């Protein structure tokens, strides 16, 4: 089972925000990057905060070294497949998450599903192809591979989709800007929603400015 580490709302518990760490990070990782960086822990009056840990696997950019990566990926470039197998099997996994979240009260429609860098890329799988019925979808200096599995979904589908909250750091040398950019007019082309954001003298890393502005966002997605 996903060890994780949850940041409880002050108040009654309404609403869930799960959001998903980088590349080689854990959940309680995360959260205390995100505390340095609002100088205070990131909290809301009614929405508990879930973060995930990726269990230990293989990566292939690391030469099959062990990392806390939510899937595999071939190389770092979006010019090439998506590892389909190994986000398929994190969905499930992830799915079973939400599930434990709707067990407990939460309605799909009160649940925000979100991540930085890979657990961006992890929450537009989730998302777009298996759980449309989110309140919204939020991806910090991430992208999808040309091809994704997410576009076929997309293509295939005729409902409403759930929002994307994007944020992107301009000189990101990890994730391109023109890799975020480009997931960003396929996902808008394709029918969703979406809000990009352009961060200058940003690389990759979380800003206060970006993080302020995301939290009022998921205040517009799930009010009190
Ligand atoms: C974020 O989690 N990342 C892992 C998947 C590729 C994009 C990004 C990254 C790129 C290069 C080096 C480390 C992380």
């Given amino acids: 089972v996903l060890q ?3 940041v409880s709302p002050a108040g009654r518990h309404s609403a869930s925000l799960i959001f998903l760490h980088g590349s080689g990070d854990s959940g309680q990782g995360l959260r205390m990057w995100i505390k340095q960086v609002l100088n205070q822990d990131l909290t809301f009056q009614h929405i508990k905060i879930i973060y995930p840990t990726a269990p230990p696997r293989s990566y292939t950019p690391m030469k099959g070294g062990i990392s806390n990566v939510w899937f595999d990926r071939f190389k770092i470039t979006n010019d090439c497949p998506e590892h ?3 986000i398929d099997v994190m969905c499930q996994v992830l799915t079973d998450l939400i599930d434990e979240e709707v067990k407990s009260g939460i309605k799909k429609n009160r649940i925000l599903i ?7 890329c992890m929450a537009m799988h989730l998302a777009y192809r298996n759980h449309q019925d989110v309140a ?3 991806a910090l200096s991430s992208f999808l591979n040309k091809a994704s599995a997410v576009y076929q979904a997309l293509q295939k589908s005729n409902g409403v989709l759930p929002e994307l909250f994007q944020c992107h750091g301009t000189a990101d040398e990890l994730v391109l800007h023109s890799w975020a950019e480009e997931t960003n007019s396929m ?3 394709l029918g969703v929603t979406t809000k990009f954001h352009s961060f200058p003298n940003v690389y990759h890393e979380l800003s206060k400015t970006e993080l302020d502005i995301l939290k009022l966002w998921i205040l517009t997605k799930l009010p009190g």
């Fill in 114 to 120: 979100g991540g930085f860098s890979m657990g961006g």
């Fill in 187 to 189: 996902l808008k082309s």
């Fill in 84 to 86: 389909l197998e190994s």
């Fill in 4 to 6: 994780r580490c949850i």
């Fill in 136 to 138: 919204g979808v939020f």
